[PDB]
Amino acid sequence: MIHLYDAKSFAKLRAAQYAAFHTDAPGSWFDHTSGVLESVEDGTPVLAIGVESGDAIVFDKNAQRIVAYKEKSVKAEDGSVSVVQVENGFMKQGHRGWLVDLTGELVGCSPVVAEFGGHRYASGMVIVTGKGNSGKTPLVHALGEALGGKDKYATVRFGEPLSGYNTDFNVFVDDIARAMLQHRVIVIDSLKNVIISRGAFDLLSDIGAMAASRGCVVIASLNPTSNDDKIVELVKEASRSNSTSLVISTDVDGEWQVLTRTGEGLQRLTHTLQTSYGEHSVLTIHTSQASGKAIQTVIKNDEL
Amino acid sequence: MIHLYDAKSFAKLRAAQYAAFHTDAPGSWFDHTSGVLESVEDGTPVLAIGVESGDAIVFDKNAQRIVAYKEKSVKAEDGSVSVVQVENGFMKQGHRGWLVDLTGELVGCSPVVAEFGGHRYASGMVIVTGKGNSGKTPLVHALGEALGGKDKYATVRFGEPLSGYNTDFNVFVDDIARAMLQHRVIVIDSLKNVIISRGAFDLLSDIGAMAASRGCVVIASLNPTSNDDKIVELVKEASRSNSTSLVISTDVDGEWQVLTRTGEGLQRLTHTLQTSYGEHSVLTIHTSQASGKAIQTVIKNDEL
Amino acid sequence: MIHLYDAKSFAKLRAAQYAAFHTDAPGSWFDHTSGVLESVEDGTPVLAIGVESGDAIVFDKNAQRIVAYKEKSVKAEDGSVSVVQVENGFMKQGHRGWLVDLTGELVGCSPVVAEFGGHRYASGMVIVTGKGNSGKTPLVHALGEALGGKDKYATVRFGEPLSGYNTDFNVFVDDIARAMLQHRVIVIDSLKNVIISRGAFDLLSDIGAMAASRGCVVIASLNPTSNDDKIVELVKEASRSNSTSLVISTDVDGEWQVLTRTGEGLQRLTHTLQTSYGEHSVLTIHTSQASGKAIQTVIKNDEL
Amino acid sequence: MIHLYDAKSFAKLRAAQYAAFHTDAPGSWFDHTSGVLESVEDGTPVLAIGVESGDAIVFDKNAQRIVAYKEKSVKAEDGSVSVVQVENGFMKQGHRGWLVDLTGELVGCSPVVAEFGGHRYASGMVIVTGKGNSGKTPLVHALGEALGGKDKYATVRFGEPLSGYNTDFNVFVDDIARAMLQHRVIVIDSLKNVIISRGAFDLLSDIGAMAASRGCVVIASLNPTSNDDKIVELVKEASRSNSTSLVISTDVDGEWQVLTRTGEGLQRLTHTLQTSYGEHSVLTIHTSQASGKAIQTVIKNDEL
Amino acid sequence: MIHLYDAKSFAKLRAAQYAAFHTDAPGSWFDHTSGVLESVEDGTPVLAIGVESGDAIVFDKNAQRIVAYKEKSVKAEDGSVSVVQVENGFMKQGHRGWLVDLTGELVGCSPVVAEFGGHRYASGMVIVTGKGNSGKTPLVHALGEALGGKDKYATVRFGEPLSGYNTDFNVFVDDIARAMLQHRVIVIDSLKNVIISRGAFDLLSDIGAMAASRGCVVIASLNPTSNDDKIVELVKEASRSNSTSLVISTDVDGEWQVLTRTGEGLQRLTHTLQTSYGEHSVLTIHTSQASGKAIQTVIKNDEL
Amino acid sequence: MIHLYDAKSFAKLRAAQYAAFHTDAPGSWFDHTSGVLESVEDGTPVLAIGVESGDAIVFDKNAQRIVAYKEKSVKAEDGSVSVVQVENGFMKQGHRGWLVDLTGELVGCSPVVAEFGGHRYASGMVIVTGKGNSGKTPLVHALGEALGGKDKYATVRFGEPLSGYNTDFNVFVDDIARAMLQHRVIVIDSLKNVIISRGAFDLLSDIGAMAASRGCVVIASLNPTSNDDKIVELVKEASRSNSTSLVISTDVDGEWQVLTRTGEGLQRLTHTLQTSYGEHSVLTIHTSQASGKAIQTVIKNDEL
Numbered sequence A, B, C, D, E, F: 001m002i003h004l005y006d007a008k009s010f011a012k013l014r015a016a017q018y019a020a021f022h023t024d025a026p027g028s029w030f031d032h033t034s035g036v037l038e039s040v041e042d043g044t045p046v047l048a049i050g051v052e053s054g055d056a057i058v059f060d061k062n063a064q065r066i067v068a069y070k071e072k073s074v075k076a077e078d079g080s081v082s083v084v085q086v087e088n089g090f091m092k093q094g095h096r097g098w099l100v101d102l103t104g105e106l107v108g109c110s111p112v113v114a115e116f117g118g119h120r121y122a123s124g125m126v127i128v129t130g131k132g133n134s135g136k137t138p139l140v141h142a143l144g145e146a147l148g149g150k151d152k153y154a155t156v157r158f159g160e161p162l163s164g165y166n167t168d169f170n171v172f173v174d175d176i177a178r179a180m181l182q183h184r185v186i187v188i189d190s191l192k193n194v195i196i197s198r199g200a201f202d203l204l205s206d207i208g209a210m211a212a213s214r215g216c217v218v219i220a221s222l223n224p225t226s227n228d229d230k231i232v233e234l235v236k237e238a239s240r241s242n243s244t245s246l247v248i249s250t251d252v253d254g255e256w257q258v259l260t261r262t263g264e265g266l267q268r269l270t271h272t273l274q275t276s277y278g279e280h281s282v283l284t285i286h287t288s289q290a291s292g293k294a295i296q297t298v299i300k301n302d303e304l
């Protein structure tokens, strides 16, 4: 919905967003939204995500797909009215994204999802990319395990010529939806076949906000393989604007750079990670500051 | 509608447009249009805006979406006839934009929306853009607060991978319509995912006139990230022709240039703004001339 | 329809086309077609113009839109048959343009619409463009007033982020049709949003011929802003081939050059105008030869 | 249909094609097909041409449009079967082009349409083009009158911002069809708006064969105005492959070069024309050899 | 269908493919397939070819178009099932290409179609192309006569602005289907208007296999006129991969190079042809080795 | 489905994926999945593959196409639900790929399909490409025979102008499905006509995963002929990301290099092959290390 502000209420919001990343307990936002979700009347639509065609499928709090749901309206304090309807397994009325308010007045945040090795990581979408010899898949799994901490991370596999890999987009968004509804740390191995159908474009622009609102983190590998400048710019835009955080490889093998967005219009943070391989290619992240647009852009041209 | 002129009535029109920006009390046009809107019969369609498909959703004077409205025709002074009809929540007959006359013979104006720091600001659409390190988001919010003055400003959030951000275009236009019907100062944070569906193209060409007719101001951040010459020219065209005013960053951090259109075919005004950050990135605009097309173009190439 | 000719009937035609521009009384063609129109049976469709989709809306002699009209055919001398039918407000049978013959055997002319400052001006479509500091809007209004002479000119406003400006294409062509049905001097302030839907392409291809047939003149500002070669070439094409006359700015502020097509197969004329500003930006045109395609192409490259 | 040949029957065909251009009486083929057309049962479809959409309208021998025609089949000696059906003014079964055999075994000819100034001219389509100052419209009309000889030529006007000019493609193909059915010499002023809908593409590839089969000549002006390499190649392809003859301007004003195709796979002929203007821009062609592909290509790059 | 192999059956297949070109009696495969076709039940669909839309028309063994055919299924040795159905003149079920097995286990061959001047020529599609002064049309006809030998060759004429030339794609495929069903040597004069609808793309990828399976040869002229790199690469791909053989012009007038594919994955053969003109441009081919991919590519760039 | 992991379950998975390629008995995965398939209830849909339009056809365990199958759902451990329904021969509900779980928790593997000449080869999709004089076709057949070992390999022929070659995409995917359902070693001779319809894009994205899941290998020749950068990049992408293994030619005729993906997140292996020709072009592979992305990219540019 829309929000109204004066100098004072804006200063307050800025303070709360700052706290959502820097001082709240890591993973607390996820626990809070998990509660809001379990307070939902059973069978009520809580999330809608676009399929290949541009249509959306809808799920309930138990990650069950709702095939039918008679029209229902809800007027928010905003004055606006939200209407949801599901016919034959597809949304007839409503919108993509969360169909229940998980944030209230706490919007534009980057809820800390976890702390590891002395650094706080943001919820939302993290794109792992870069050129060079550092492997993306091993890094995505090591980050998944690290941010998970005491919790197991969820792995969504898509579009790789390996055994058991799903290659159907519609199954992919269904896997993604279920993961976000049930797990704080999510790994997506291969955004590649996504980088185009209306569904893929929707996913690219919707997932980061979906995750940030839930307080969960989605870690997706994006190999900028092609040298075709039209998708190169797409990968770069995804890395710059549809991602809450960016993890990109450097000149030095095994070393990565993390760029974190801490809130709407706030400064981006940056830090470096060292990594190494153990048996069967299992990678470990070793544990042993603000950046301006100038810096941001320099990192981005690495994609060229 | 169309208007007829001879030298004398054209001169009177030019004098009136001049006063609409330079001498009318700031924000008085907004108060005037609020009265016109309130004098509308309850349930009568006053505003139509396009959704993603290119279809239009319609609202009444109370920012409530009209789903059913029997065909009704009105013949204007012009002799032309306006016909409106709404079926199943969508405009069957009519046009995008204001469905009631908010202007009469006072057309082609840039109704002054507010005065701040000794400068008059126009209603209509303001695009905040530019390259460099000066942040756009902090600026749109500071400008929203400053032009709001005694009034709170409305914030429409769209397409950012942050908590509570809507990413569905159809919800976005619903938020925009309601904001313009109820508030004089609006902030749109992120025109990014707009820069393409028919709905997005409609918004870009419709919003400035909608707002200028209402006497409200829509301050939209537009980060010219991509270097893909096709959207680059789209961003530049938007900044040059679809905006009533332009606020662009300079070589010096914290400093901005404001290019204001004062009326149809009138000269543009320019002035500079100095700004600084305080706690939690809250930005403040400090407060302590005509330009030609050549100057205009020079600023525009900053976009490259 | 088609016309048959031999050396003699061809010479007569060229003599008559020459007269239509060079010796006929200014604005006499418009008075004549006004006569043809008014002598039409009430309700008879007289003009069809394309809407956005490519469909056409139809008007009667009083600029009223015909929503229903039973199929009716007419056989001309040509032997050809014209069939017109209107269903649910849209043309089911017929063609875009004038539905009644306003020309007969007198075709291929640029009927003189007015004489001002010692120069004869042609009816049809005039595109006012060019790069530089010379203002397009002040110029079209000044031309409208001057060619209007004793008569007021009609102003059609479209696609500008200013008050009261319509931005819906379908309302635009309805405005245009009515203006041509009722006035000899018409100004369109902004073909910009036209420069693409089938309706827009249709308008660019139809308007010039429509106006010339009626003996009215349509003066349209076309700011060649974008540097995107695809539309830049569209602006040139429109300026070169869809315009009966071209008024383009020069290196000297306030100075313009006029290129006039005087008839089918005839030479273009050229003359220069000096102008100056008075109060509130009201512009005045001061009063106080054939060209070859070489000259014409040179002017055209000013668009680059 | 298909044709079978052995060395002897092929040599015979080659001899007949040679005679169709070089020795038959000018215009005799037209008279022959005129007879074949008048021997057609009244109301039977003889010609089908594509409209904008890609559908085709059909005419009878009197250039009357057939709106209904119950399915009918005809087996040619080829063994093949030709079926024609017209429903609601549109061909339901059949093909574009002549629906009655006008040629028999005499195919691949370039029937001499006329002789003038010591040169034989071919039927089919002639495209008049080129850069420079020589005017296309005056030349098309002078050629029309010259080839007409004792007969008047038919003029089809399309897409020019002049009085009485039709701008609707569907009316244009109807004018073209009628002209080919009733006249040996046809002039089309402006193929411009054709150079894209399926109808325009069809016309470009169909007209030359339509005319060549009838023994009529279609003279169309094609101004290679745009510098957009995609249509430049289109104009060049039209001039090279969809035209039976090409008339192109040279470095010297008033001088033209004619390139004539004399038959399928035969050598092209070339000659030069001198011209001059009389009163009201009436142009006269003064009256007082084989070329290879090398030569052909050189002429074609003139279009660049 | 699919075929299984071990070293031994693969060796036998390679030996059989070798003999299909090098040792079988010229044109014997065509005689063989004629017998297979004649043994088909009357009315049974034997061949389907695509029309412009991408739909397919179907024929019986007597080159008669089938408009109605009740669904019928046949299970091949492969285990697969072929189902055919024809409704309202169009294939409802089935596939493009031969609907009956003309090959059995003899697949991947280039059945020798004829021997002339001491050289064996393959069935399938032959594209005649190249730049320079050597004429394509005279060559396809001379080759049609030479490979026909004791038999007349079939000529399918398409898309040339000459008398009796069909320009409708749907008639073109009907002519092609019938020719291949009834004649061993076919000449297609003009693949030009093909080089795009789904039907045209289908023809390019289907014709070579259709003909090679029948044992017939289709000699198509392809004039690489345009310099538009996109169709240039299309012409080159057609010449390289969609043709069983390629006949291309050299630097010397009248001299051609013949590149023949002898089987799947086998080596290509090359030989040179000298030619000369006689009366009325009738060309005669005078009669008085393996190449590598490098040579292959060299010839191909001649197309640039 | 999705899988949850912590450090320990992840290490086990990587150990198992390593084993699937490095130590499991060659071809044992295929025997295992053959077991899963045969234990499926007759009639149960087991595999869905896309046809040209983007729709999917479905097969049972016996490679028979299912035309009708009433909606049936199944809930996996994942909690997710799989729903399959087939109407009129097409999948109404379900997804492309395997409709029955062939992998369970064992995902992301490249199951060893065979061992030949001291090298283990992976199941999944192998693309055989490269520039130069080394023949693709002889190589795929030689690999098919070698990896076949004691078993015959299945050959799927598509898009070549030779006898018996199918050129219809829908028959192609039916051939492919049947081959994977019934054979461990499969060769596709020509993905060329695939490199675009939704079906083609689907195939390129699905086949590798399908084959790897089954434990079968699909060897496809892909001749990178065109120099059109758009498809050149499509060939690289397919070679880089849609292939489980890549076999590409070198500077030395007869010599190839093999790049094998050994598992999800694992390193690629590389080895070189020498080959030679025997009778009738039958090729023999002679029998007698990890790579980094740098190495991999260098190989890829050989495509340019």
Ligand SMILES: Nc1ncnc2c1ncn2[C@@H]1O[C@H](COP(=O)(O)CP(=O)(O)OP(=O)(O)O)[C@@H](O)[C@H]1O
Pocket: A240, A241, A264, A265, A266, A267, A268, A291, A292, A293, B133, B134, B135, B136, B137, B138, B160, B192, B221, B223, B225, B277, B280, B281, B282
């Ligand atoms: N306290 C502070 N001091 C200096 N700069 C600050 C600041 N707080 C915020 N900023 C700057 O404000 C800017 C905020 O970003 P914006 O320019 O609005 C684009 P964004 O929306 O953050 O990302 P986007 O363009 O990908 O959507 C950044 O340059 C940030 O560094």
Ligand SMILES: Nc1ncnc2c1ncn2[C@@H]1O[C@H](COP(=O)(O)CP(=O)(O)OP(=O)(O)O)[C@@H](O)[C@H]1O
Pocket: B240, B241, B242, B263, B264, B265, B266, B267, B268, B291, B292, B293, C133, C134, C135, C136, C137, C138, C160, C192, C221, C223, C277, C280, C281
């Ligand atoms: N009094 C004055 N003296 C000098 N120039 C004036 C003037 N009044 C207006 N102008 C110029 O007239 C021009 C008016 O704008 P125009 O070029 O006609 C269209 P616009 O207002 O720029 O809208 P647009 O950019 O969307 O097309 C500007 O160059 C303005 O500076």
Ligand SMILES: Nc1ncnc2c1ncn2[C@@H]1O[C@H](COP(=O)(O)CP(=O)(O)OP(=O)(O)O)[C@@H](O)[C@H]1O
Pocket: C263, C264, C265, C266, C267, C268, C291, C292, C293, D133, D134, D135, D136, D137, D138, D223, D225, D277, D280, D281
């Ligand atoms: N008396 C004359 N002397 C010299 N040139 C003349 C002339 N009369 C006409 N022309 C030329 O003939 C042409 C007439 O204009 P048009 O009818 O438009 C034919 P065009 O200009 O060749 O094609 P177009 O439609 O692209 O402009 C112009 O070049 C005009 O200058």
Ligand SMILES: Nc1ncnc2c1ncn2[C@@H]1O[C@H](COP(=O)(O)CP(=O)(O)OP(=O)(O)O)[C@@H](O)[C@H]1O
Pocket: D240, D241, D264, D265, D266, D267, D268, D291, D292, D293, E133, E134, E135, E136, E137, E138, E160, E192, E221, E223, E225, E277, E280, E281, E282
């Ligand atoms: N007797 C002869 N002596 C020399 N050349 C001859 C000839 N007869 C015909 N030719 C040449 O044969 C060629 C015939 O043209 P082709 O190369 O087949 C292309 P076309 O079909 O004529 O035109 P197109 O490519 O635009 O469709 C021309 O180069 C012509 O000069």
Ligand SMILES: Nc1ncnc2c1ncn2[C@@H]1O[C@H](COP(=O)(O)CP(=O)(O)OP(=O)(O)O)[C@@H](O)[C@H]1O
Pocket: E240, E241, E242, E263, E264, E265, E266, E267, E268, E291, E292, E293, F133, F134, F135, F136, F137, F138, F160, F192, F221, F223, F277, F280, F281
């Ligand atoms: N005995 C032999 N000695 C050397 N090279 C041979 C050979 N037999 C076959 N070849 C080569 O093997 C290759 C066979 O062709 P491939 O590249 O596999 C596909 P193609 O037959 O060219 O069809 P395509 O061009 O449509 O893809 C050719 O380079 C051929 O010269």
Ligand SMILES: Nc1ncnc2c1ncn2[C@@H]1O[C@H](COP(=O)(O)CP(=O)(O)OP(=O)(O)O)[C@@H](O)[C@H]1O
Pocket: A133, A134, A135, A136, A137, A138, A223, A225, A277, A280, A281, F263, F264, F265, F266, F267, F268, F291, F292, F293
């Ligand atoms: N033990 C190890 N030592 C060094 N590198 C290793 C490694 N194990 C795996 N890698 C590297 O990690 C990557 C594993 O391949 P993938 O799973 O495909 C991730 P990627 O290659 O970064 O993305 P991709 O899918 O585009 O190939 C490769 O670069 C591989 O070389």
